[PDB]
Amino acid sequence: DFSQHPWKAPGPNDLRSPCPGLNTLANHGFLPRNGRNITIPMIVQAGFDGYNVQPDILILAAKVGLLTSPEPDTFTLDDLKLHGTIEHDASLSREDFALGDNLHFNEAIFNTLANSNPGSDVYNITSAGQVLKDRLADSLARNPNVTNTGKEFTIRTLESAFYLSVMGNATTGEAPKNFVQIFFREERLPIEEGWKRSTTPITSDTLNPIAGQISEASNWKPNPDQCPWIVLSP
Amino acid sequence: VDFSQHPWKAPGPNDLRSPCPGLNTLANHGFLPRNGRNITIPMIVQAGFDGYNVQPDILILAAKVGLLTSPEPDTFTLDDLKLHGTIEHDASLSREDFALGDNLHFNEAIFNTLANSNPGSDVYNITSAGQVLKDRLADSLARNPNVTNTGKEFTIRTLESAFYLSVMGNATTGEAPKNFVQIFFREERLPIEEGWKRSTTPITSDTLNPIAGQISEASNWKPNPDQCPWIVLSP
Ligand code: HEM
Ligand code: HEM
Ligand SMILES: [Mg+2]
Ligand SMILES: [Mg+2]
């Protein structure tokens, strides 16, 4: 029932993340609107309620997210900005940590995703891959501190599988462009615009094939002498 | 803390245990569930404080990484913690390498090195701890073609050695009566009847790290050249 879950703009003391997925859930009150005191069970519930995303992938992501917080079993959405845990260079809608603000939505960065799949009414696996190339190529040219290993790349293919899957079709990875634009720009569920919570459950068995196809369409190579790492503590 | 309400009891076949004498001992006295199940990060902080006077910072971090070994949302079992390459590492003090046998259970043959350390002394110390780290790594290098030896394992090994010296011994000097350390590993018991008292000084990152750092210097250690440190993220 989305009627109990109206969108509201985050106010002054309301903490947000670099993740449109969680920010959208907070802005609809599926997570605390203040973005504080989030447990792994609250993530599993908000993800299932909002998007029909199943626990498997949410538990893993939330456990890694926890490492960004000094708290025993909670994090704030602001904690999740910690560079090198999940937050990575070559984001779709955020600047690289080394160049500026790795937290907030940035229209200038988002422009690439916005303008992708020209002449189509959807983003798809092909356009998602092209955006991954363009964003990485940007960070490699302007960021001498770029981190581009297997870890960041896997997360990038998964995050791109996420926007295609939760705003669009979880099997084909096609998503109406206006749904994806609203998701990123307003961190809002485009309910009035016709968006429905996925009827098909979003699992690692649906996300992985989509992430894999985005990967193939990205024509990716790692930086040669970089070791994959999860920063373990703030 | 009242240890009278926390009696040692031999773990049964019902009861899940880890490769960690620290947690296993806490479970054996009922500071953690004796069945070794349904352990939250808050239960770890409390059991660590109650049993050993260990402060939350280092326990929170260790427990959050331990969680990665579990498919459950916010709990692990002690048996989950055996997952090779999360925390569990080659060149353990009392367990065999995953590649060569059992990386879970106490092994007397492996423990022999630590047991015979600091010969002609009644205590184990930073010097003997360092020598045991060299000897155990050298053993794994000789016998384990698949040995993983990077900054991550080494840091964890210096910390785990700082832990046995600190919780069974003196948290400032890193000296520990040998029979305390030997019961801790062999029986996963607080040696209360044998005179062990919970540390009066709080065991923190600021007490552990200096000890781990000195153990490191006494270990004369080098990483394997072409290995990347990594935390295995899921079973
Ligand atoms: C619930 C479904 C989820 C969806 C649909 C989702 C979606 C996304 C998307 C599309 C991005 C890419 C943003 C960009 O590159 O500009 C992203 C980034 C991120 N997400 Fe999620 N997410 C979800 C769950 C989670 C969870 C559970 C966590 C952590 C607990 C998380 C943490 C992050 C972080 C830290 C980033 C920053 C990565 C970066 O761009 O550098 N997300 N998410
Ligand atoms: C609370 C005080 C703690 C103490 C005194 C302690 C002590 C130790 C010691 C001495 C070892 C080395 C055993 C050996 O090499 O044979 C060890 C190993 C281990 N501990 Fe802990 N520990 C503590 C807390 C924790 C916590 C909170 C976790 C995870 C939640 C944990 C997980 C492990 C694991 C997985 C190993 C296996 C490492 C290996 O030898 O391969 N311990 N612990
Ligand atoms: Mg980023
Ligand atoms: Mg081991």
Short mmCIF file of all heavy atoms in Angstrom, two decimals, chain A residues 39-41 44 59-60 63-64 66-74 151 226-230 232-233, chain B residues 40-42 45 60-61 64-65 67-75 152 227-231 233-234:
data_model
loop_
_atom_site.label_atom_id
_atom_site.label_comp_id
_atom_site.label_asym_id
_atom_site.label_seq_id
_atom_site.Cartn_x
_atom_site.Cartn_y
_atom_site.Cartn_z
N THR A 39 18.70 -0.43 10.60
CA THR A 39 19.17 -1.79 10.86
C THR A 39 19.12 -2.59 9.56
O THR A 39 18.41 -2.18 8.62
CB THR A 39 18.31 -2.50 11.91
OG1 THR A 39 17.08 -2.81 11.26
CG2 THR A 39 18.04 -1.67 13.15
N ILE A 40 19.79 -3.74 9.54
CA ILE A 40 19.72 -4.63 8.34
C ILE A 40 18.29 -5.09 8.14
O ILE A 40 17.81 -5.05 7.03
CB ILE A 40 20.74 -5.76 8.41
CG1 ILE A 40 22.14 -5.17 8.33
CG2 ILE A 40 20.48 -6.79 7.30
CD1 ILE A 40 23.21 -6.10 8.76
N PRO A 41 17.53 -5.50 9.18
CA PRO A 41 16.12 -5.88 8.96
C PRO A 41 15.27 -4.75 8.37
O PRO A 41 14.42 -5.07 7.58
CB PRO A 41 15.66 -6.27 10.37
CG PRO A 41 16.92 -6.80 11.01
CD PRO A 41 17.99 -5.84 10.53
N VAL A 44 15.94 -4.80 4.58
CA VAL A 44 15.30 -5.99 3.94
C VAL A 44 13.80 -5.71 3.74
O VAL A 44 13.28 -5.98 2.67
CB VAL A 44 15.50 -7.26 4.80
CG1 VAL A 44 14.67 -8.44 4.30
CG2 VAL A 44 16.97 -7.64 4.94
N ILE A 59 20.72 -8.03 2.23
CA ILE A 59 21.45 -8.42 3.47
C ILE A 59 22.94 -8.14 3.23
O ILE A 59 23.53 -7.34 3.98
CB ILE A 59 21.17 -9.89 3.83
CG1 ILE A 59 19.75 -10.08 4.38
CG2 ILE A 59 22.21 -10.43 4.81
CD1 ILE A 59 19.28 -11.53 4.40
N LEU A 60 23.50 -8.68 2.15
CA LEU A 60 24.93 -8.47 1.79
C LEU A 60 25.26 -6.97 1.72
O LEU A 60 26.24 -6.56 2.35
CB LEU A 60 25.17 -9.14 0.44
CG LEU A 60 26.58 -9.02 -0.10
CD1 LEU A 60 27.62 -9.51 0.91
CD2 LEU A 60 26.69 -9.80 -1.40
N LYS A 63 25.07 -5.29 5.19
CA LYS A 63 26.18 -5.73 6.07
C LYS A 63 27.44 -4.96 5.71
O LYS A 63 28.18 -4.56 6.63
CB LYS A 63 26.38 -7.24 5.94
CG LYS A 63 25.37 -8.07 6.70
CD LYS A 63 25.61 -9.53 6.49
CE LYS A 63 24.64 -10.42 7.23
NZ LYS A 63 24.95 -11.83 6.89
N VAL A 64 27.67 -4.73 4.42
CA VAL A 64 28.84 -3.93 3.97
C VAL A 64 28.64 -2.47 4.36
O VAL A 64 29.60 -1.87 4.85
CB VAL A 64 29.08 -4.13 2.47
CG1 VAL A 64 30.24 -3.27 1.99
CG2 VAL A 64 29.33 -5.59 2.16
N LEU A 66 27.04 -1.34 6.90
CA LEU A 66 27.28 -1.29 8.37
C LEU A 66 28.72 -0.89 8.67
O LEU A 66 28.92 -0.14 9.64
CB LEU A 66 26.96 -2.64 9.02
CG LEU A 66 25.75 -2.65 9.95
CD1 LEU A 66 25.71 -3.93 10.77
CD2 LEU A 66 25.71 -1.42 10.85
N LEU A 67 29.67 -1.36 7.86
CA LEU A 67 31.13 -1.12 8.06
C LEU A 67 31.42 0.38 7.99
O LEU A 67 32.51 0.76 8.44
CB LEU A 67 31.93 -1.87 7.01
CG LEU A 67 31.76 -3.39 7.00
CD1 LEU A 67 32.45 -4.04 5.81
CD2 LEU A 67 32.30 -3.99 8.28
N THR A 68 30.51 1.17 7.42
CA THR A 68 30.68 2.64 7.24
C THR A 68 30.30 3.37 8.53
O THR A 68 30.49 4.56 8.58
CB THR A 68 29.86 3.18 6.07
OG1 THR A 68 28.45 3.11 6.34
CG2 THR A 68 30.19 2.47 4.77
N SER A 69 29.67 2.68 9.47
CA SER A 69 29.10 3.25 10.72
C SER A 69 29.93 2.79 11.92
O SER A 69 30.33 1.63 11.94
CB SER A 69 27.67 2.80 10.86
OG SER A 69 27.14 3.08 12.14
N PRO A 70 30.21 3.64 12.95
CA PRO A 70 30.82 3.16 14.19
C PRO A 70 29.81 2.47 15.13
O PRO A 70 30.22 1.90 16.11
CB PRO A 70 31.34 4.45 14.84
CG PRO A 70 30.36 5.51 14.37
CD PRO A 70 29.93 5.08 12.98
N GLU A 71 28.51 2.53 14.81
CA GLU A 71 27.45 1.94 15.66
C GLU A 71 27.52 0.43 15.62
O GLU A 71 27.92 -0.17 14.61
CB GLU A 71 26.05 2.35 15.20
CG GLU A 71 25.78 3.82 15.30
CD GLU A 71 24.93 4.22 16.48
OE1 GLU A 71 25.05 3.58 17.58
OE2 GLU A 71 24.14 5.15 16.32
N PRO A 72 27.09 -0.25 16.71
CA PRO A 72 26.99 -1.70 16.72
C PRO A 72 26.16 -2.29 15.57
O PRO A 72 26.64 -3.19 14.94
CB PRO A 72 26.33 -2.01 18.07
CG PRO A 72 26.65 -0.82 18.94
CD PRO A 72 26.73 0.36 18.00
N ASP A 73 24.93 -1.83 15.33
CA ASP A 73 24.05 -2.54 14.36
C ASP A 73 23.16 -1.58 13.57
O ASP A 73 22.18 -2.05 12.95
CB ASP A 73 23.24 -3.62 15.09
CG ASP A 73 22.38 -3.07 16.20
OD1 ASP A 73 22.38 -1.83 16.43
OD2 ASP A 73 21.76 -3.88 16.86
N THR A 74 23.49 -0.29 13.56
CA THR A 74 22.79 0.72 12.73
C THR A 74 23.80 1.54 11.93
O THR A 74 24.99 1.59 12.31
CB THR A 74 21.92 1.68 13.54
OG1 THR A 74 22.80 2.32 14.46
CG2 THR A 74 20.77 1.00 14.24
N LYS A 151 36.11 -5.08 -7.89
CA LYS A 151 35.11 -4.75 -6.85
C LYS A 151 34.21 -3.61 -7.35
O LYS A 151 32.98 -3.80 -7.35
CB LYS A 151 35.75 -4.40 -5.50
CG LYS A 151 34.74 -4.40 -4.35
CD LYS A 151 35.09 -3.52 -3.18
CE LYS A 151 35.05 -2.04 -3.49
NZ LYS A 151 35.14 -1.24 -2.23
N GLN A 226 46.17 -2.45 -9.23
CA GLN A 226 45.23 -2.11 -8.12
C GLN A 226 44.62 -3.39 -7.53
O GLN A 226 44.14 -4.25 -8.30
CB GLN A 226 44.11 -1.18 -8.59
CG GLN A 226 44.57 0.24 -8.85
CD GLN A 226 43.43 1.22 -9.04
OE1 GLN A 226 42.35 0.90 -9.54
NE2 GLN A 226 43.70 2.46 -8.68
N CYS A 227 44.64 -3.53 -6.20
CA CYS A 227 44.04 -4.68 -5.49
C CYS A 227 42.63 -4.29 -5.07
O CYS A 227 42.43 -3.21 -4.55
CB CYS A 227 44.86 -5.10 -4.27
SG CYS A 227 46.28 -6.15 -4.68
N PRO A 228 41.61 -5.13 -5.35
CA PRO A 228 40.26 -4.89 -4.84
C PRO A 228 40.25 -4.85 -3.31
O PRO A 228 40.83 -5.72 -2.72
CB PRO A 228 39.41 -6.06 -5.37
CG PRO A 228 40.39 -7.06 -5.97
CD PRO A 228 41.70 -6.33 -6.20
N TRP A 229 39.58 -3.85 -2.72
CA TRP A 229 39.51 -3.68 -1.25
C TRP A 229 38.18 -3.07 -0.82
O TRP A 229 37.73 -2.14 -1.50
CB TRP A 229 40.66 -2.82 -0.74
CG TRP A 229 40.77 -2.80 0.76
CD1 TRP A 229 40.75 -1.72 1.59
CD2 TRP A 229 40.90 -3.96 1.60
NE1 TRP A 229 40.89 -2.12 2.89
CE2 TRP A 229 40.98 -3.49 2.93
CE3 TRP A 229 40.98 -5.34 1.36
CZ2 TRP A 229 41.13 -4.36 4.01
CZ3 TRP A 229 41.13 -6.20 2.43
CH2 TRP A 229 41.21 -5.71 3.73
N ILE A 230 37.63 -3.55 0.29
CA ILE A 230 36.53 -2.90 1.05
C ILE A 230 37.12 -2.19 2.26
O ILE A 230 37.53 -2.90 3.19
CB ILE A 230 35.47 -3.91 1.50
CG1 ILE A 230 34.95 -4.78 0.35
CG2 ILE A 230 34.35 -3.20 2.25
CD1 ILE A 230 35.44 -6.21 0.43
N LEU A 232 37.14 -0.87 5.72
CA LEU A 232 36.45 -1.71 6.75
C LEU A 232 35.96 -0.86 7.91
O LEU A 232 35.18 -1.37 8.75
CB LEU A 232 37.41 -2.79 7.25
CG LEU A 232 37.75 -3.86 6.22
CD1 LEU A 232 38.80 -4.83 6.76
CD2 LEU A 232 36.49 -4.60 5.79
N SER A 233 36.44 0.37 7.96
CA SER A 233 36.03 1.23 9.09
C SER A 233 36.24 2.69 8.72
O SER A 233 37.20 3.01 8.02
CB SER A 233 36.76 0.86 10.36
OG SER A 233 36.48 1.79 11.39
N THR B 40 24.22 -11.67 17.91
CA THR B 40 24.14 -10.30 17.39
C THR B 40 25.41 -9.55 17.77
O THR B 40 26.13 -9.97 18.69
CB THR B 40 22.94 -9.55 17.97
OG1 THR B 40 23.28 -9.26 19.32
CG2 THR B 40 21.63 -10.32 17.90
N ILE B 41 25.65 -8.43 17.13
CA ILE B 41 26.82 -7.58 17.43
C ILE B 41 26.69 -7.07 18.87
O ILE B 41 27.66 -7.11 19.61
CB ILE B 41 27.00 -6.49 16.37
CG1 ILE B 41 27.35 -7.14 15.04
CG2 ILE B 41 28.04 -5.47 16.82
CD1 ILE B 41 27.21 -6.22 13.86
N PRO B 42 25.51 -6.61 19.34
CA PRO B 42 25.38 -6.22 20.75
C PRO B 42 25.73 -7.34 21.75
O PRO B 42 26.30 -7.02 22.77
CB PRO B 42 23.90 -5.81 20.84
CG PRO B 42 23.59 -5.29 19.46
CD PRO B 42 24.32 -6.26 18.55
N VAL B 45 29.56 -7.45 22.05
CA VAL B 45 30.12 -6.31 22.83
C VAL B 45 29.95 -6.60 24.33
O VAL B 45 30.91 -6.44 25.06
CB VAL B 45 29.45 -4.99 22.42
CG1 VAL B 45 29.75 -3.87 23.41
CG2 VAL B 45 29.83 -4.58 21.01
N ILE B 60 33.01 -4.58 17.87
CA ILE B 60 32.00 -4.14 16.86
C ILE B 60 32.57 -4.48 15.47
O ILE B 60 31.94 -5.26 14.71
CB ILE B 60 31.64 -2.65 17.02
CG1 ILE B 60 30.80 -2.39 18.27
CG2 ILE B 60 30.91 -2.15 15.78
CD1 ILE B 60 30.75 -0.94 18.70
N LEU B 61 33.76 -3.98 15.17
CA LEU B 61 34.43 -4.21 13.87
C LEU B 61 34.54 -5.71 13.57
O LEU B 61 34.18 -6.12 12.45
CB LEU B 61 35.81 -3.56 13.89
CG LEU B 61 36.56 -3.70 12.58
CD1 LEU B 61 35.76 -3.05 11.45
CD2 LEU B 61 37.95 -3.10 12.69
N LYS B 64 31.10 -7.27 12.91
CA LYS B 64 30.55 -6.82 11.61
C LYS B 64 31.19 -7.63 10.48
O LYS B 64 30.48 -8.03 9.54
CB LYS B 64 30.75 -5.33 11.40
CG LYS B 64 29.81 -4.43 12.18
CD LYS B 64 30.16 -2.98 12.02
CE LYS B 64 29.18 -2.06 12.71
NZ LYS B 64 29.61 -0.65 12.61
N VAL B 65 32.47 -7.93 10.59
CA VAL B 65 33.16 -8.75 9.55
C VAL B 65 32.70 -10.20 9.68
O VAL B 65 32.47 -10.83 8.63
CB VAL B 65 34.69 -8.61 9.66
CG1 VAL B 65 35.38 -9.50 8.64
CG2 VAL B 65 35.10 -7.15 9.53
N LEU B 67 29.81 -11.23 10.66
CA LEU B 67 28.46 -11.20 10.04
C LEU B 67 28.52 -11.59 8.57
O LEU B 67 27.61 -12.30 8.12
CB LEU B 67 27.83 -9.81 10.19
CG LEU B 67 26.63 -9.69 11.12
CD1 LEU B 67 25.91 -8.37 10.90
CD2 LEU B 67 25.68 -10.87 10.95
N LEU B 68 29.57 -11.19 7.85
CA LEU B 68 29.73 -11.46 6.39
C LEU B 68 29.80 -12.96 6.14
O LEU B 68 29.62 -13.36 4.97
CB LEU B 68 30.98 -10.77 5.84
CG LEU B 68 31.02 -9.25 5.98
CD1 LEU B 68 32.36 -8.69 5.54
CD2 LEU B 68 29.89 -8.60 5.19
N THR B 69 30.10 -13.76 7.16
CA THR B 69 30.22 -15.24 7.04
C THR B 69 28.83 -15.89 7.11
O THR B 69 28.74 -17.11 6.92
CB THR B 69 31.10 -15.84 8.13
OG1 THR B 69 30.47 -15.70 9.41
CG2 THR B 69 32.49 -15.24 8.16
N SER B 70 27.82 -15.12 7.49
CA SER B 70 26.46 -15.60 7.80
C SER B 70 25.49 -15.17 6.70
O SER B 70 25.58 -14.04 6.24
CB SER B 70 26.04 -15.08 9.14
OG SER B 70 24.67 -15.30 9.37
N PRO B 71 24.56 -16.04 6.24
CA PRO B 71 23.46 -15.60 5.38
C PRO B 71 22.34 -14.89 6.16
O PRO B 71 21.50 -14.28 5.54
CB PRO B 71 22.94 -16.91 4.76
CG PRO B 71 23.25 -17.95 5.83
CD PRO B 71 24.50 -17.48 6.54
N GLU B 72 22.33 -14.96 7.49
CA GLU B 72 21.25 -14.32 8.29
C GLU B 72 21.41 -12.81 8.28
O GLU B 72 22.51 -12.30 8.15
CB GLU B 72 21.21 -14.85 9.73
CG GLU B 72 20.44 -16.15 9.82
CD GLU B 72 18.97 -16.02 9.39
OE1 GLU B 72 18.14 -15.63 10.23
OE2 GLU B 72 18.67 -16.28 8.22
N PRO B 73 20.30 -12.06 8.41
CA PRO B 73 20.36 -10.60 8.40
C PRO B 73 21.31 -9.98 9.44
O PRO B 73 22.11 -9.17 9.05
CB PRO B 73 18.92 -10.15 8.67
CG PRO B 73 18.06 -11.35 8.28
CD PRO B 73 18.92 -12.57 8.46
N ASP B 74 21.19 -10.32 10.72
CA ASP B 74 21.92 -9.59 11.79
C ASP B 74 22.49 -10.53 12.86
O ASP B 74 22.88 -10.05 13.94
CB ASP B 74 21.02 -8.51 12.39
CG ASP B 74 19.75 -9.05 13.01
OD1 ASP B 74 19.51 -10.26 12.91
OD2 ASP B 74 19.00 -8.25 13.52
N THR B 75 22.54 -11.83 12.56
CA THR B 75 23.14 -12.84 13.44
C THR B 75 24.12 -13.71 12.65
O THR B 75 24.01 -13.82 11.39
CB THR B 75 22.10 -13.76 14.09
OG1 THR B 75 21.40 -14.36 13.01
CG2 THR B 75 21.16 -13.04 15.02
N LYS B 152 46.54 -8.44 5.38
CA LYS B 152 45.29 -8.66 6.16
C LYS B 152 45.52 -9.78 7.18
O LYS B 152 45.26 -9.55 8.36
CB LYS B 152 44.10 -8.96 5.24
CG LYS B 152 42.76 -9.10 5.95
CD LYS B 152 41.72 -9.86 5.16
CE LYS B 152 41.89 -11.37 5.24
NZ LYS B 152 40.64 -12.08 4.91
N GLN B 227 50.09 -11.48 -4.11
CA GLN B 227 48.78 -11.75 -3.45
C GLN B 227 48.09 -10.43 -3.05
O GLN B 227 48.73 -9.55 -2.46
CB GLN B 227 48.94 -12.65 -2.22
CG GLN B 227 49.15 -14.12 -2.58
CD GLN B 227 49.15 -15.05 -1.38
OE1 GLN B 227 49.36 -14.66 -0.24
NE2 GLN B 227 48.93 -16.32 -1.65
N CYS B 228 46.79 -10.36 -3.30
CA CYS B 228 46.01 -9.17 -2.91
C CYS B 228 45.27 -9.48 -1.62
O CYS B 228 44.66 -10.54 -1.54
CB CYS B 228 44.97 -8.87 -3.98
SG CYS B 228 45.62 -8.70 -5.66
N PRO B 229 45.32 -8.60 -0.61
CA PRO B 229 44.51 -8.79 0.59
C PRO B 229 43.03 -8.82 0.19
O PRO B 229 42.65 -8.03 -0.63
CB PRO B 229 44.79 -7.54 1.42
CG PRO B 229 45.44 -6.57 0.47
CD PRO B 229 46.16 -7.41 -0.56
N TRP B 230 42.25 -9.74 0.78
CA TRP B 230 40.79 -9.73 0.50
C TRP B 230 39.93 -10.33 1.62
O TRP B 230 40.36 -11.30 2.23
CB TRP B 230 40.50 -10.45 -0.82
CG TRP B 230 39.06 -10.36 -1.22
CD1 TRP B 230 38.16 -11.39 -1.29
CD2 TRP B 230 38.33 -9.18 -1.60
NE1 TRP B 230 36.94 -10.93 -1.69
CE2 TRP B 230 37.01 -9.58 -1.89
CE3 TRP B 230 38.67 -7.83 -1.72
CZ2 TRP B 230 36.04 -8.67 -2.29
CZ3 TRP B 230 37.71 -6.93 -2.13
CH2 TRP B 230 36.41 -7.35 -2.41
N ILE B 231 38.77 -9.72 1.88
CA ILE B 231 37.75 -10.32 2.78
C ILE B 231 36.69 -11.00 1.91
O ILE B 231 35.90 -10.27 1.29
CB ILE B 231 37.10 -9.27 3.69
CG1 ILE B 231 38.13 -8.48 4.49
CG2 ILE B 231 36.07 -9.92 4.59
CD1 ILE B 231 38.24 -7.05 4.04
N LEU B 233 33.30 -12.28 1.06
CA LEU B 233 32.16 -11.41 1.46
C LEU B 233 30.91 -12.24 1.71
O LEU B 233 29.98 -11.70 2.35
CB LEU B 233 31.92 -10.38 0.35
CG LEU B 233 33.01 -9.32 0.23
CD1 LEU B 233 32.75 -8.42 -0.96
CD2 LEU B 233 33.12 -8.52 1.52
N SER B 234 30.89 -13.49 1.26
CA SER B 234 29.67 -14.31 1.34
C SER B 234 30.01 -15.78 1.22
O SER B 234 30.97 -16.14 0.53
CB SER B 234 28.68 -13.87 0.30
OG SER B 234 27.53 -14.70 0.28
#
